[PDB]
Amino acid sequence: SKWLEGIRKWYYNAAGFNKLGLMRDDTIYEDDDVKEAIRRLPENLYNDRVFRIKRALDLTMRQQILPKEQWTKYEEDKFYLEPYLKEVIRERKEREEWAKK
Amino acid sequence: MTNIRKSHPLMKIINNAFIDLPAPSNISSWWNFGSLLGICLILQILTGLFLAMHYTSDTTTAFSSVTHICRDVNYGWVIRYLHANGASMFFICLFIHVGRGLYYGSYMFLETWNIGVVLLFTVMATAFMGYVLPWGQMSFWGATVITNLLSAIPYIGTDLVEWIWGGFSVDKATLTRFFAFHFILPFIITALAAVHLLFLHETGSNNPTGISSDMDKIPFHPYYTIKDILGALFMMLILLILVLFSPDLLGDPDNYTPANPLNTPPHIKPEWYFLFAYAILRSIPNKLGGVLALVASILILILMPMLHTSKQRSMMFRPLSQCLFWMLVADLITLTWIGGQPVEHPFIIIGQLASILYFLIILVLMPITSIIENNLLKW
Amino acid sequence: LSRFLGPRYRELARNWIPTASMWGAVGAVGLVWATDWRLILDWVPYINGKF
Amino acid sequence: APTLTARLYSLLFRRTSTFALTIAVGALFFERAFDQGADAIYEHINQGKLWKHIKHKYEN
Amino acid sequence: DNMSIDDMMFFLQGQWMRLCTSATESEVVRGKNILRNALVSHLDGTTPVCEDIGRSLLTYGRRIPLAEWESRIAEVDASVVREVCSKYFYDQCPAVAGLGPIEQLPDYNRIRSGMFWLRF
Amino acid sequence: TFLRWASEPEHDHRKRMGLKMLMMMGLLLPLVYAMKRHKWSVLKSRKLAYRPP
Amino acid sequence: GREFGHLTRMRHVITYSLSPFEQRAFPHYFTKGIPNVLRRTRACILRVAPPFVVFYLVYTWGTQEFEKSKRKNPAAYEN
Ligand code: HEM
Ligand code: HEM
Numbered sequence: 001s002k003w004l005e006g007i008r009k010w011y012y013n014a015a016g017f018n019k020l021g022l023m024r025d026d027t028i029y030e031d032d033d034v035k036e037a038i039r040r041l042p043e044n045l046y047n048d049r050v051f052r053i054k055r056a057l058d059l060t061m062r063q064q065i066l067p068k069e070q071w072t073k074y075e076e077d078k079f080y081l082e083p084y085l086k087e088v089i090r091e092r093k094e095r096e097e098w099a100k101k
Numbered sequence: 102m103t104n105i106r107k108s109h110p111l112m113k114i115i116n117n118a119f120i121d122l123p124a125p126s127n128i129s130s131w132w133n134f135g136s137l138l139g140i141c142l143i144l145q146i147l148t149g150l151f152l153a154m155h156y157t158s159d160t161t162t163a164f165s166s167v168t169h170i171c172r173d174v175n176y177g178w179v180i181r182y183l184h185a186n187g188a189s190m191f192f193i194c195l196f197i198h199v200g201r202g203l204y205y206g207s208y209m210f211l212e213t214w215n216i217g218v219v220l221l222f223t224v225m226a227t228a229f230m231g232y233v234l235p236w237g238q239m240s241f242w243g244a245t246v247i248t249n250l251l252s253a254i255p256y257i258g259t260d261l262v263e264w265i266w267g268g269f270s271v272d273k274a275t276l277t278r279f280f281a282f283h284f285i286l287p288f289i290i291t292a293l294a295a296v297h298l299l300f301l302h303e304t305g306s307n308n309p310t311g312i313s314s315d316m317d318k319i320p321f322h323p324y325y326t327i328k329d330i331l332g333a334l335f336m337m338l339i340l341l342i343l344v345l346f347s348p349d350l351l352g353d354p355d356n357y358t359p360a361n362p363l364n365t366p367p368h369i370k371p372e373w374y375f376l377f378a379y380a381i382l383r384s385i386p387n388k389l390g391g392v393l394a395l396v397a398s399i400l401i402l403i404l405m406p407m408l409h410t411s412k413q414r415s416m417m418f419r420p421l422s423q424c425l426f427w428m429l430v431a432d433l434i435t436l437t438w439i440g441g442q443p444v445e446h447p448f449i450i451i452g453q454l455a456s457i458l459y460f461l462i463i464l465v466l467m468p469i470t471s472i473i474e475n476n477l478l479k480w
Numbered sequence: 481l482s483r484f485l486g487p488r489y490r491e492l493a494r495n496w497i498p499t500a501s502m503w504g505a506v507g508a509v510g511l512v513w514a515t516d517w518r519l520i521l522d523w524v525p526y527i528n529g530k531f
Numbered sequence: 532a533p534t535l536t537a538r539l540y541s542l543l544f545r546r547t548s549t550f551a552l553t554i555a556v557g558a559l560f561f562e563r564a565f566d567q568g569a570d571a572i573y574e575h576i577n578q579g580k581l582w583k584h585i586k587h588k589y590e591n
Numbered sequence: 592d593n594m595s596i597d598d599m600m601f602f603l604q605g606q607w608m609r610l611c612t613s614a615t616e617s618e619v620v621r622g623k624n625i626l627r628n629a630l631v632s633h634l635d636g637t638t639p640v641c642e643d644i645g646r647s648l649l650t651y652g653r654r655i656p657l658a659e660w661e662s663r664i665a666e667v668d669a670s671v672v673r674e675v676c677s678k679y680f681y682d683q684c685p686a687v688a689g690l691g692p693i694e695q696l697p698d699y700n701r702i703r704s705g706m707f708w709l710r711f
Numbered sequence: 712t713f714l715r716w717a718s719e720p721e722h723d724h725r726k727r728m729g730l731k732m733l734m735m736m737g738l739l740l741p742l743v744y745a746m747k748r749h750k751w752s753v754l755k756s757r758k759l760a761y762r763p764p
Numbered sequence: 765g766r767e768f769g770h771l772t773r774m775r776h777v778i779t780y781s782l783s784p785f786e787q788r789a790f791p792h793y794f795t796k797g798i799p800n801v802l803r804r805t806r807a808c809i810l811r812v813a814p815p816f817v818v819f820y821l822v823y824t825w826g827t828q829e830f831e832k833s834k835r836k837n838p839a840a841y842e843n
Contacts, residue, residue: 011477015418016807020310024478029206029414030313043775044763050316050774051761057317060127060310062755063800079479100486104601123768126754171721178721179728305766315772319754323700327747334743338736345729357718423811431815435822447829451822545682547709569731576730581723594769684783695769699753699781748789756787758780 009074018072019065020056025049025081033092037084045080118298123318124325125308131201132306133332134194139294140333141191146287148184149231156234158280160273163236164359179344186343188228189351190336192374195221196433199402204426206414207307208406212300218402220293225399227286228374230279233271237356238366244271244279246369250395253388270362311415370441377433380440383449384456394456401463408464411471412480421470429462593692600697604705611676612711619669630660682707 012018017027026049028034038046059066106116155174157166170177199221201207208214233244248265252258267274308314319325343350351373355366371379378395385391416422432455439452512520521527533541543553574581634640634657647654684703689696697705716722748755 008477008479011420011474014420015478017418022312024480027310027312027413027418028480029209029311029412047761047763047775047777050772051759051777053312053314054316054759054774054777055761056310056312057125057127057308057314058757058759060308063804065803096483099488100483101488102602104598107598121768123766123771178725302766313772316774316777318768318771320698320701320768323698323704323750324754327743327750331740331743331747334736334740338740341729341732341736345725345732348725420811424815427812427815431819434816435819438823442826442830445830446833447826451826546711547707548711565731565734569734570727573727573730577723577726594767597768684785692769694771694774695767699783700750703783703785745789749784752784752787752789752791753781756782756791760778760780761776762778763776 012074012077016065017056018074018077020059021066021070021072022052022056023072023077023080025079026052026056028081028085033085033088034081036088037081040084040088041081049080118302119326120320120322122302122321123305123315124321125306125314126317126319126324127308127310127314128306128325129309130332131197131205131309133329134197134201136329137332137336138191138194138198140336141187141194142287142290142294145184145187145191146291148180148187149284149287151180152184153284156280158234158277160236160276160360163234163276167235178348182344182348183340185352186340186348188231189343189373190340191224192228194336195224196374200426200430203405204416204423205307205309206311206409206416208402209409209414210301210304210307211406213297213304214406215403216293216297216300218399220290220297221399221402223286223290223293225375227283227290228372230283230286232372233276233279234283235356236276236360238358238360239353239356239369241271241360241362242365242369243371244275247371248275250382250388250392253392255389307414309415309417311413311417368443373437373441376438376440377436378440380436380452381456381459383440383444384453398459401460405463408468409471410468410475412475412478419471419474421474422467425462425467425470429459432459432462594695596693596695597697600702601705604702607676607680607706608708608711610672611681612673612708614669614672614676616669619667619672622672623664623667626664627661630657680706 017024030038038049041049055066106112106120152170155166155170155177157163167181170181172178174180198217202214202217229244229247233240248262248271251265252262254261263269265275265278266272267278305315353368353370355368358366370376378398381398382391382395385394411419411422413419416426435451435455436459439448439455442448511517516530518531522531543549574584578584634643644654683706685706687696687699687702719725
């Protein structure tokens, strides 16, 4: 596990979404399941996601990166969207299975 | 009362297109290459129209007409070399735009991407037909080889080739047909580009981070208008450098000799933008296999959206995918270089390996790498 | 392909196969008719008079 | 005490009409001046080669 | 409304520029009459009169009599209005504060561009 | 030299136009860049603050 | 469809901006710009350069090998 966690942390630091203040779920592609998951988010998390995204887009606009002390840590990254996305995908799978037979 | 910009129908369309279009605030200079392509298309249309006022499509007078444009039409050389080097700048911008689409996941816009692939095919056809028009040795023999490639198609290849030729081989009929087609196609390109922009505006524009930028949209008129003008100025600088300092840098010298159908030039190579496809064609020993590989090289952009497996649209946050992407770009440069070089022991194997690596990177290595990245992110 | 692998889609394929076969025949005849494909047209009795 | 730039604004740049007229006149004079200067530079760089530099020898 | 902010801003800036560039005598007379009525109506009752006295002493150092206000209003003409509006409103960077669903509110570059007319 | 003149009779004129375009671009590109920066400074200096209730 | 009014829903995000005429076009252009360019180059180079390094190696090897191929082989004329 520790070796796997090490390589995962290496990839996390290699990717730059922590540098821009974004969390992992902030960087997911907005497909229809993801759109429904975003729609279902509670207001606080939705507003926080919107602001983090806006701040990141602003930083990329000026080709700057957030100060290192403000970088999102690997441990403190919270997968807020993941439960909602799993629920949405489960509902879609159930609908597809019913359609199959 | 109403503002005429928002209410008059033509002005309404123009406003929604390039005045009040909500554009992401973080699009980079890689997002100016599309406007650069549009400017290149308009410039090519104007320059080609002025060239055609002095160009004659008969074989007896084609080369003499080109010489007349170069030496006797006032500022004719400016127009001619503007066209010749603007084609190269056109393909530079096309390749850069395709690379931007691959890198930032812009291919997820399915309709825009497919219309863009159609535009790429039409532009490559226009360039090939235009190159025949000066009727030099390179024009004649490159046309012969590229058209002869179609004969590999089973059971209809000979008939299709002879129909396109208008005869048994490339001759006056083929030259006149290519002139007519090279004239008409750019306007079809403009129409397809209009459809392209329509589909793009339907879904907006993807930003470099790959995340939806509806929160951070800015008007197009007060920002990207001046940004694109600046890009146009830089592109014009590069183009005028080519035109006024190295007018023959990107053109083969042999095309300045009148076409001799009985003697071939020492080297028969297509223009530089076609060189990677030419190398892929030469890589496969079988003729039909080579033609199919050449078609698949471009058609793989159609399959690119299906191949997408990463949970992230853009490669900005995917380092391994970036390594693969730059390997692909280097491989394309390698293919261009090999297509330039003669078919011999060192170049053949490098070309074969390069083509295999191109198809492998696009089809297998990239999706598996994206899956690995998804696992690494615990997605 | 995962979604379209079930009993209903297999039934749906069977329902539309006769229609798909019929349209394919329309394409087959149209191609031969438009191209005047002598290979196929020689077998047809009356049209064989063309050649 | 207005600076030169403020004076220029308040005189010509305030209203678009005077701005455009200034742009046009500047365009004409700049065209003349730049043409003269650049031609001088090119001639000096290529001094001794240009036909205009050697026509006198073969003329008359 | 959220979808009418841009239009209203356009019309407001258009009115500003119209006053700056091509004001007319009739609307000037209307504005002067409205100002006279506002001045006379406001200074009615002990509370507003005392407020005006105190504020005028603090600011103007003197309570400007209504006759002086009338004379100054009467001096105003279309030329005066155009001059002062061009000085304070034309090609001047504005200060904008927005609250609520203000997404349609034009970006500051557009707002500043509206402060001048390319025709004038 | 004569053959080069024959092949490219616009050589000297091409060089003159190239010099002129180099000077004109050296003038314009900084100026158009300055205009772009002037328009973009509002966004570049923009400060966004999240103030949740 | 996609118009500024109804693009998305955002709340409690306050943005402060300055007039272009009140701010400098090139603020700290070289003092800050050059370090930022160096940082961007450092981040990108490890991913970008190695493929082109491999291409350069391949190109040099191919050119040299072709030149050797054209060159005469003494053993062919030993007899
Ligand atoms: C995307 C647009 C275009 C591309 C990429 C393109 C490409 C080319 C190329 C590569 C050449 C060879 C020039 C040379 O060998 O020096 C050429 C020549 C020519 N094209 Fe185009 N062309 C385009 C549009 C047009 C249009 C719209 C016209 C006419 C309305 C036109 C008319 C000509 C003519 C007359 C020539 C002969 C110039 C010469 O002999 O050097 N072209 N074109
Ligand atoms: C003459 C050729 C072309 C013209 C005139 C043209 C025009 C444009 C323009 C004006 C844009 C918007 C500006 C921008 O996004 O940078 C654009 C974007 C785009 N084009 Fe092209 N294009 C051409 C070739 C292509 C090709 C060959 C492809 C794909 C193989 C393509 C696919 C796309 C895509 C996916 C976008 C979306 C980019 C984004 O959303 O960031 N286009 N095109």
